[PDB]
A paper describes a structure:
Group-4 alternative σ factors—also referred to as “extracytoplasmic σ factors” ([name] σ factors), based on functional roles in response to cell-surface and other extracytoplasmic stresses—are only distantly related to group-1 σ factors and are substantially smaller than group-1 σ factors, lacking four of the six functional modules present in group-1 σ factors. For example, the Mtb [name] σ factor σL mediates the response to oxidative stress and regulates its own synthesis, polyketide-synthase synthesis, cell-wall synthesis, lipid transport, the oxidative state of exported proteins, and virulence.
We prepared “downstream-fork-junction” nucleic-acid scaffolds containing P-[name] sequences, analogous to the downstream-fork-junction nucleic-acid scaffolds containing consensus group-1-σ-factor-dependent promoter sequences used previously for structural analysis of group-1-σ-factor-dependent transcription initiation. Because the P-[name] transcription start site (TSS) had been mapped only provisionally, we prepared and analyzed a set of downstream-fork-junction nucleic-acid scaffolds having different lengths—4 nt, 5 nt, 6, or 7 nt—of the “spacer” between the P-[name] promoter -10 region and downstream dsDNA. Transcription experiments indicated that all analyzed nucleic-acid scaffolds were functional in σL-dependent de novo transcription initiation at the expected TSS (with the initiating nucleotide base-pairing to template-strand ssDNA 2 nt upstream of dsDNA), and σL-dependent primer-dependent transcription initiation at the expected TSS (with the primer 3′ nucleotide base-pairing to template-strand ssDNA 2 nt upstream of dsDNA), with highest levels of function observed for a spacer length of 6 nt. X-ray datasets were collected at synchrotron beam sources, and structures were solved by molecular replacement and refined to 3.3–3.8 Å resolution. However, map quality was highest for the nucleic-acid scaffold having a spacer length of 6 nt, and therefore subsequent analysis focussed on structures with a spacer length of 6 nt (Mtb RPitc5-σL_sp6).
Author numbering:
A (entry chain C): 443 to 1129
B (entry chain E): 28 to 108
C (entry chain D): 440 to 1011, 1026 to 1170
D (entry chain D): 1220 to 1281
E (entry chain B): 1 to 233
F (entry chain C): 28 to 50
G (entry chain A): 2 to 226
Write the structure that this text describes.
RNA sequence: CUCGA
């Protein structure tokens, strides 16, 4: 889906499979968190479906020894003295000592400030213990979390429930057309993108000789040239657009191991899983009712949440009993207008926009004469069209697909291309759609705050700030204090300060809230980028102080108050909203759960040959399953005819379904339901 | 004693349950009459002894289920349980 | 109504669209009409609207727990690709909007549409068939919006001032339209107490009596009220002739009104009234200033002081474990009660420190959503967290999520969070399995007769008499007494009967027997209904969803089964306890019972427990043998000691529970009779659901027990 | 035996069904669902099912 | 720009002094633009007349009760505030109301100076006790909208004169909602619905036409700036 | 500064604790 | 308390931002007037934009041109920033040819008579030695925002690449009112409208268009039934 | 197998 999803997949630890355990034999004890998983397997990142606990992600600093156990690094404390010597301990090796938590107050020499410090002991015991007892201590605070988990800013303010969803949904982000790095970061976004392998890093130091949208050439110091080719508009495994773009320009000195070009979900080398959106935390006329989301149409007009998707379509020409399937533009009983987008071979031409039902590859298969309907042989005689022994088996666009044809690949047995035995030609057509953000597309943040788009208001309808800038997204307030994910509120505050910038009062010394902050944080410019590392990062004392010194806009006015709220105007009436509303910038991701894929409907269509019931799934153009539980609802209502109707004429009644379709197009009444063919099979199976 | 019923709510489900013994009985009264009205529209051009036409005045492109449900409300039909 | 995408409707109604495309001569033949729909010619969108006109559709969301999991709607063509659902049916579907999908089914035949129009329409199913209380009511933003304007604020601008000095009374408006014009300019606040002359709202039945009384209040007559402008705007949504309510609209208050509206006023009024509450709730929820900011998460003022007092008491229990005076198994139990007591003192420190203007409090205290335990976890402290074993960790998470948990604090929290989600998949599996078992055992239970005429019934504890002299309402009235029908005239101390036999127990008709002094009523029950196969309607009673007598032919068994299996998602007793009862298993408690009434002969020792009973009439001594690990239930004794722990010499009755636990339902039958064992199972199952906040009427539990005792065994052929 | 074979223990019910040679009167909710009959409940019972509707003698002239 | 056709105004008359107006079909999403503006123009920008202050003989420093009548002081002010009145004179006018003896006072028992008209002579004002007498002086002025009594504190003479809320505006209650209509296979076109309840001084038709004139004049100030093209039909 | 090892953009971190070992 | 006719006087801040004060409005009237102008400004002000483009070497958005640093998708996104005005009100064609080392800017476009480019310094693409960029740009005139017209709906053949058209020339609109709430006979609201455009038209021209739009609309209430 | 409610 995105680089993070790929990097996480390689670091997965799966209990299932051969030699492990069966899913039906995995009890509630294998799946839950064990105290030996600290710094080895993440306690947060795991699916919430039937594979919960059975699939984990390796912790960040963790590694595997040649035996098979997972080691995690620690700083060896000799006698209450922190040393820079680091040693990796296995799981059982860790229990034979006691280790101090990473956030221990430590002297500049290395001595612990308190005699009693929070220390982990064997069997998952936490207690204070003398400073002369600490054998090791954690490397980093975030030592226990996974890479994806470590990307959630203010993670220590979100409950584990929504934190799990936060990391799991980051892997579901969709690569947008253009990508922006988040204002509020954790620092992990850089290494996560580089180590994932979807960017282009310089192997050796040198200068940029030539740069194009196609490739980047680097002239090394010794004299050799290495050229990196960009992956442009390539279909990913899950239909997302993997597209790399050069970053450097002509004649730029680039160091070794530096990002010279970045791919999907990357901006200047950092994980850009979404966009920075101006968010207001308020209910709005019920359009954001329990977890629904309201969006400004600006995100549509400016392609802010627009993403490219590519589908692969395929068909082949085989040898049949009565001849050979041939791919040809000549298709029986088709106008020159539908075939107008096809070349002389029967293939759609590059660049042609194709809706659903349009022909992509024109293939005809010879059908025998003894396979003809009585009406079809009469209909063939009353049209005088002889020599049409072939029928239409062309490759058409599925329902719900549409886009520009971007590439064609043809494989022919005639041209040394190795096809499976019995095939004479193979064609693959790549179709790319440009998907703007739509009503019902699923957005989400980094704190497990998910929701579908409930309404995309015009830019004027949106509640706007004092200087006319409308907000981009309206998140409901009711869905905040239940989930225990205040991190989105804290990110919104720090997000605004990043958008505006700040200046702390330097006169009369450094204030008492900014004493712990680094000197680099005392002054910030608008649209500055910041890191809130997991279990470290911004404290509420410093965040409260930043809102008090936010930089004014171009007009010189401070829009947000020290509380973090601002005064909004109802764009639909004009009256200002009666109370200040929390307003800031939040990083929102477009998840790969779009209505363009998830909408489906069927009047009639294919039926499973054996049971004579409609097929399943959208891809097979199937119908919905009125299951066992759903039939109890009908009977509870007493809706007898609806129940009989569902299970007969609308399902597996071979003659009833055809006579109902005729009764509708005739305007007649619905006929009487017959006997299900599935019940006929049951009897023939009992026999 | 209520606001004007809009859309499918009209005729009010409360008044329709007065000319009938139960919710389940009103379903058959309306459906069986709806089939009569539907057969009149398809046997008006051909055949004699065609079923009795819509008793009330129908709206333009009104569904026979809606026509039958209005005349049950207007006490123009009978029944036999 | 419901909004479904245009592209969905075209394919759903494809044969109907093809029919009209050839009628209006947009297409030559039906063959080319099909090509027009597949190619989406611009003529189909105008035709498609004519087709879906008043043609209902079915909406459904898995899982289909109860029958309201499928409801009928009138489709309205909307652009986009998402289904538009009404915000009030979200409770019935249990549907949030975080990526949920629903299925649409199109009824074809005339009978199928009629069943959707009348039986399955969402407007005709506002009440829950399981409990009778409404479901399509203001729930989240709507209840907060209504809770906003119906609040009385003292210092609010435009308030009423008594006449003092040279100026007369300030803040008395001739018309609500004037108070609107006052609030428009900015003099009056919608939450300020004022005096308004009202002319289109019935006064309370209390004050309507003193003003008119002889004749009902008339639309046009005037009267004074001491409300807020918002409370007047709220009462406007309610229909004319409804008594004005000057209270603050909590969710409980709104649910009480809608329940009263469903009982008295007709269906179409209830459906249209709640739409007004929906539109009005959303409007004022938008303008209620409800927001979450870091500033609004107030921290306890004595947070440091409170924990240090318990860190001291924990350090003393830790030192009392250093000298070995406390067992290790006891130190954990000792420290747990230190932090359980500590988390209460922190939670109390939040309630008083938090103002009532703070939105976090306004959300919870209005019935909108959330617990204060969540708010306490949010601002005060998380508390004791559970490890995957089950017992609480001897060390609590002292930090709050506003403060920020430490690395170790966060790690120990995840243990309970992951196992919380883990068993939620298993607990739903055993729930859905128990549900489908209940379906098949009662699938064929139908109402086939109007009245079976049996005067048999059962006695229901309507209320409890008191030594003080005032009757106390029994807690089991809602689930066991309401919606019943009588099988014996209620007689007070006077000769007059208060309610006749065969009258549905409405809300006032219960206060009629309450104010009459009678505390017991004999009601018709589905248990005593003597019918060959099904059950008669008179013994069933009021259909909770319809609010009236159950119709003949309604599959009350499937409704009862779904009513019990839908809340089964939330249990701990617990869910296996519910399975022990419905499967008639010899329980884990295995409590003994008194086979014969008489005198208690307690022969207790320490090696074991043996107890005999001398029969109060004839017979011989009956000897038992029980383990000393149990304890005797505090039995109500004949000499007025309700908490009389069973010692020898007490006079216990036949079929009286001896020791605590769960009496074997198999043995309860072979002692007191089939009538009494059915009563045991009903209120024993009910105690597992009541001890969780779920109100299922005893009627539904009784429909299942009737199927368990329909068979007898053969002793002699 | 048809309502039981679709609940639990399909073989255990079908074995005892052919031995005792049980015949099933198709009168039940679970049974009629399988064969496609109207369920004997709600609008399916004979009281509401077999119902005749006719217009009152008052009729229009056109 | 481009042409935007078919916007029409229809009126449904509930009562003689309360009608419902529908403006259809406004292209999306204008219904809100000219929605709240039309309401505020009706409620605040139509010239009307109403009582500014009153003075009751026998009431000086009390303001609690008037002797000889059942109604107290504030109940007199209410029925006087709802007195509908119209004036052709811009300057403030003083009207006297007097009636003695047991009986009932009405707004017809008032004597109106030339130019002023009382439109509800049957409106009850006070019930006269036995041997009861009531003298009261009313001050009527022209204005627009609703002005509180507190601002009229200076208008009252230091001799038992009390100021009152002035309901100058002829319209009493206006609400509006916006729905959706489909002109050309687009479901977003807005339909605006206006509900205007007015006094019997003017009908809802003229109240709306008055608001339209004052708004065209208002936006005419912007129109005068350049006279460029704009979506018009 | 945060991650001053590859030549990346300068993200400013609210870090009170030094990182002894790089990822 | 009687009427004084309101007056509107323009204040200039820069060449594409102006404040407008309107007074004296009735109390509470100021906020609603500012909104009704803002909504008409942000939506219904006529302007010109580029409908479709046509690059010679390409046949669709999802490709690259040899020698240019940006793919065609990124080039089109840069072209969405173009501000342009057209006198023709009918489709008209702009051209752009550039080659050799250098940067192609909006000034490198040669507009036909009637059409003019209002920010000739906007970056479009970077070209190296081997890079040659030849682009046609069709510019129409409408209002608001119209998405890219489909090739199946238009008569456009394969080479044409439709683009979204952002027609509105207004950039940012706000307002503030100052209420005179001193308890006295005289209360009034003063509206301060703030309008910023994109150099296609001046702020007063935009407010004039929104004025003539609303004057026409509110005239529907003045006509009797 | 992987995920969505
Ligand atoms: Mg959900
Ligand atoms: Zn009975």
């Amino acid at each position: 889906n995105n680089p993070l999803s790929g990097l996480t997949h390689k670091r997965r630890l799966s209990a299932l499979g051969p030699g492990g355990l069966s899913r039906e034999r995995a009890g509630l004890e294998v799946r839950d968190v064990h105290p030996s998983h600290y710094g080895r397997m993440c306690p947060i990142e795991t699916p919430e479906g039937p594979n919960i606990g059975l699939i984990g992600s390796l912790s960040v600093y963790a590694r595997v020894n040649p035996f098979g156990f997972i080691e995690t690094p620690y700083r060896k404390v000799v006698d209450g003295v922190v040393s820079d010597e680091i040693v990796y301990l296995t799981a059982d090796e860790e229990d034979r000592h006691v280790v101090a938590q990473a956030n221990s107050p430590i002297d500049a020499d290395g001595r612990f400030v308190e005699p009693r410090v929070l220390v982990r002991r064997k069997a998952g015991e936490v207690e204070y213990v003398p400073s002369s007892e600490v054998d090791y201590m954690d490397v980093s605070p975030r030592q226990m979390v996974s890479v994806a988990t470590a990307m959630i800013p203010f993670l220590e303010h979100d409950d584990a429930n929504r934190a799990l969803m936060g990391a799991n949904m980051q892997r579901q982000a969709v690569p947008l057309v253009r990508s922006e790095a988040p204002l509020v970061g954790t620092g992990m976004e850089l290494r996560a993108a580089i180590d994932a392998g979807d960017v282009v890093v310089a192997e050796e130091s040198g200068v940029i000789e030539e740069v194009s949208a196609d490739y980047i050439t680097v002239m090394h110091d010794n004299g050799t040239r290495r050229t990196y080719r960009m992956r442009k508009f390539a279909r990913s495994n899950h239909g997302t657009c993997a597209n790399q773009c050069p970053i450097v320009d002509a004649g730029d000195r680039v160091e070794a191991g530096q990002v010279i070009a970045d791919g999907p979900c990357t901006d200047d080398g950092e994980m850009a899983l979404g966009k920075n959106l101006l968010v207001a935390i308020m209910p709005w006329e019920g359009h954001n009712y329990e977890d629904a989301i309201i969006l400004s149409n600006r995100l549509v007009e400016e392609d802010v949440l627009t993403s490219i998707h590519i589908e692969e379509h395929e068909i082949d020409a085989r040898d049949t009993k009565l001849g050979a399937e041939e791919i040809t533009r000549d298709i029986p009983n088709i106008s020159d207008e539908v075939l107008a987008d096809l070349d002389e071979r029967g293939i759609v031409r590059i660049g042609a926009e194709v809706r659903d039902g349009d022909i992509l590859v024109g293939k005809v298969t010879p059908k025998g004469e003894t396979e003809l309907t009585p009406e079809e042989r009469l209909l063939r005689a009353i049209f005088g069209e002889k020599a049409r022994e072939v029928r239409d088996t062309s490759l058409k666009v599925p329902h719900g697909e549409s886009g520009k044809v971007i590439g064609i690949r043809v494989f022919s047995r005639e041209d040394e291309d190795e096809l499976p035995a019995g095939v004479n030609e193979l064609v693959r057509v790549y179709v790319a759609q440009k998907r703007k953000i739509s009503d019902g597309d699923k957005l989400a943040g980094r704190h497990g705050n998910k929701g579908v788009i409930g309404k995309i208001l015009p830019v004027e309808d949106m509640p706007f700030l004092a200087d006319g800038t409308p907000v981009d997204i309206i998140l409901n307030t009711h869905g905040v204090p239940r989930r225990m994910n205040i991190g989105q509120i804290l990110e919104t505050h720090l997000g605004w300060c990043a958008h505006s910038g700040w200046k702390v009062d330097a006169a009369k010394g450094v204030p008492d809230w900014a004493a712990r902050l680094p000197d680099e944080l005392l002054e910030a410019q608008p649209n500055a980028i910041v890191s809130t590392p997991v279990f470290d990062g911004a404290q509420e004392a410093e965040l409260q102080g930043l809102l008090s010194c936010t930089l004014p806009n171009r007009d010189g006015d401070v829009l947000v108050d020290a509380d973090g709220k601002a005064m909004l105007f109802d764009g639909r009436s004009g009256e200002p909203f009666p109370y200040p509303v929390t307003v800031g910038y939040m990083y929102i991701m477009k998840l790969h759960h779009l209505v363009d894929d998830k909408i489906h409907a069927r009047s009639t269509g294919p039926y499973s040959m054996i049971t004579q019931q409609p097929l399943g799934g959208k891809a097979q153009f199937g119908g919905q399953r009125f299951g066992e539980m759903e039939c109890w609802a009908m009977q509870a209502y007493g809706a007898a005819y609806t129940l009989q109707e569902l299970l007969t004429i609308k399902s597996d009644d071979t003659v009833g379904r055809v006579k109902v379709y005729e009764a509708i197009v005739k305007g007649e009444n619905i006929p009487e339901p017959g006997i299900p063919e599935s019940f006929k099979v049951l009897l023939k199976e009992l026999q | 004693g209520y606001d004007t019923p809009l859309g499918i709510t009209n005729p009010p489900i409360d008044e329709l349950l007065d000319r009938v013994s139960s919710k389940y009985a009103l379903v058959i009264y309306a459906a069986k009459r709806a089939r009569q009205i539907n057969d009149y529209y398809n046997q008006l051009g051909e055949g004699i002894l065609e079923y009795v036409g819509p008793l009330v005045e129908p709206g333009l492109q009104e569904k026979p289920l809606s026509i039958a449900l209005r005349e049950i409300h207007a006490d123009l039909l009978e029944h036999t349980e | 109504q419901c909004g479904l995408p245009k592209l969905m409707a075209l394919e759903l109604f494809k044969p109907f669209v093809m029919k009209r495309l050839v009628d209006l001569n947009h297409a030559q033949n039906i063959k080319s009409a099909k090509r027009m729909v597949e190619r989406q010619r611009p003529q189909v969108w105008d035709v498609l609207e004519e087709v879906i006109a008043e043609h209902p559709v079915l909406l459904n969301r898995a899982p289909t727990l109860h029958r309201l999991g499928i409801q009928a709607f009138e489709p309205m063509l909307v652009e986009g690709k998402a289904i538009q659902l009404h915000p009030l049916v979200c409770e019935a579907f249990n549907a949030d909007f975080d990526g949920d999908q629903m299925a649409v089914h199109l009824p074809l035949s005339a009978e199928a549409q009629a069943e959707a129009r009348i039986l399955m329409l969402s407007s005709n199913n506002i009440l829950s068939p399981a409990s009778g209380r409404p479901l399509a009511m203001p729930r989240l933003d709507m209840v907060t919006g209504l809770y906003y304007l119906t609040t009385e604020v003292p210092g609010d601008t435009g308030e009423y001032q008594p006449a003092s000095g040279d100026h007369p009374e300030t803040g008395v408006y001739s018309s609500p339209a004037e108070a609107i014009m006052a609030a428009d300019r900015g003099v009056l606040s919608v939450r300020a107490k004022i005096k308004v002359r009202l002319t289109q709202l019935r006064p309370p039945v209390e004050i309507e009596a003193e003003l008119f009384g002889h004749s009902g209040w008339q639309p046009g007559d005037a009267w004074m009220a001491e409300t807020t402008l918002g409370r007047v705007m709220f009462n406007e949504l309610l229909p004319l002739g409804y008594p004005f309510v000057n209270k603050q609209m909590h969710k409980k208050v709104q649910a009480a009104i809608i329940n009263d509206l469903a009982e008295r006023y007709p269906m179409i009024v209830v459906a249209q009234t709640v739409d007004k509450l929906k539109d009005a709730g959303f409007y004022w929820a938008t303008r209620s200033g409800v927001t979450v900011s870091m500033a609004d998460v107030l921290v306890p003022p004595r947070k440091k002081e409170i924990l240090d007092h318990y860190e001291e008491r924990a350090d003393k229990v830790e030192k009392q474990f250093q000298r070995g005076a406390l067992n290790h198994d006891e130190r954990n139990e000792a420290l747990v009660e230190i932090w359980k007591e500590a988390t209460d003192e922190v939670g109390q420190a939040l309630r008083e420190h938090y103002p009532d203007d703070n939105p976090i409090i306004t959300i919870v205290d209005s019935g909108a959503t959330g617990n204060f335990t969540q708010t306490r976890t949010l601002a005060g402290m998380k508390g004791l967290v559970t490890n995957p074993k089950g017992e609480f960790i001897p060390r609590p998470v002292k930090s709050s999520f506003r403060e920020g948990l430490t690395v170790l604090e966060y790690f120990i929290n995840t243990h309970g969070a992951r196992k919380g989600l883990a068993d939620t998949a298993l607990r739903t599996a055993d729930s859905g399995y128990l549900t489908r078992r209940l379906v098949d055992v009662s699938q064929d239970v139908i109402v086939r007769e109007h009245d079976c005429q049996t005067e048999r019934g059962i006695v229901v504890e309507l209320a409890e008499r008191a030594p003080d002299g005032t009757l106390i309402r029994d807690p089991y009235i809602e689930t066991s007494a309401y919606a019943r029908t009588l099988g014996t005239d209620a007689v007070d101390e006077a000769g007059n009967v208060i309610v006749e036999r065969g009258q549905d127990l409405g809300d006032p008709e219960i206060d009629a027997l309450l104010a009459a002094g009678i505390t017991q009523v004999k009601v018709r029950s589905v248990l005593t209904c003597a019918t060959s196969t099904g059950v008669c309607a008179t013994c069933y009673g009021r259909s909770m969803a319809t609010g009236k007598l159950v119709d003949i032919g309604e599959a009350v068994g499937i409704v009862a089964a779904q009513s019990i299996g839908e809340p089964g998602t939330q249990l701990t007793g617990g869910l296996p306890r519910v399975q022990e009862l419905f499967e008639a298993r010899v329980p884990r408690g295995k409590a003994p019972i008194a086979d014969v009434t008489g005198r208690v002969r307690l022969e207790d020792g320490e090696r074991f427990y043996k107890i005999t009973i001398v029969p109060d009439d004839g017979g011989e001594e009956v000897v038992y043998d029980k383990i000393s690990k149990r304890q005797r239930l505090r039995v109500f004794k004949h000499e007025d000691g309700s908490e009389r722990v069973l010692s020898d010499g007490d006079h216990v009755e036949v079929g009286q529970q001896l020791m605590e636990g769960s009496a074997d339902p198999h043995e309860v039958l072979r002692v007191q009779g089939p009538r009494e064992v059915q009563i045991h199972l009903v209120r024993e199952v009910q105690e597992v659901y009541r001890a969780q906040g779920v109100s299922i009427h005893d009627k539904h539990i009784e429909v299942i027990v009737r199927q368990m005792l329909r068979r007898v065994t053969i002793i002699d052929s | 035996w048809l309502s039981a074979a679709s609940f639990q223990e399909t073989t255990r019910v079908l074995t005892d069904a052919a031995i005792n040679c049980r015949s099933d009167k198709l009168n039940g909710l679970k049974e009629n669902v399988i064969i496609g009959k109207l369920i004997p409940a709600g609008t399916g019972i004979n009281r509401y099912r077999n119902i005749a509707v006719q217009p009152t003698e008052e009729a229009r002239a056109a | 720009m481009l042409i935007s056709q078919r916007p029409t105004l229809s009126e449904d008359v509930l009562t003689d002094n309360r009608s419902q107006f529908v403006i259809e079909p406004l292209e999306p999403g204008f219904g809100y633009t000219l929605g709240n503006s039309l309401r505020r123009t009706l409620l605040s920008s139509i010239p009307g007349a109403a009582v500014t202050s009153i003075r009751i003989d026998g009431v000086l420093h009390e303001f609690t009760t008037v002797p000889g009548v059942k109604e107290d002081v504030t109940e007199i002010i209410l029925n006087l505030k709802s007195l509908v009145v119209s004036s052709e004179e811009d300057e403030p006018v003083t009207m006297y109301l007097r009636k003695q003896g047991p009986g009932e006072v009405t707004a017809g028992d008032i004597v109106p100076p030339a130019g002023v008209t009382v439109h509800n002579p049957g409106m009850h004002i006070a019930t006269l006790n036995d041997k009861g007498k009531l003298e009261v002086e009313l001050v009527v002025e022209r204005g627009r909208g609703y002005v509180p009594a507190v601002q009229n504190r200076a208008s009252g003479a230091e001799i038992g004169r009390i100021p009152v809320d002035s309901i100058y505006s002829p319209v009493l209650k206006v609400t509006y909602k916006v729905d959706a209509t489909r002109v050309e296979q687009r479901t977003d076109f807005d339909k605006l619905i206006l509900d205007v309840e007015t006094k019997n001084s003017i009908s809802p038709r003229d109240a709306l036409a008055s608001a339209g004139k004052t708004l065209v004049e208002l936006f005419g100030l912007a129109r005068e700036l350049n006279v460029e093209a704009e979506g018009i039909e | 500064s945060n991650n001053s090892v590859p030549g990346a953009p300068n993200r400013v971190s609210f870090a009170k604790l030094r990182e002894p070992l790089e990822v």
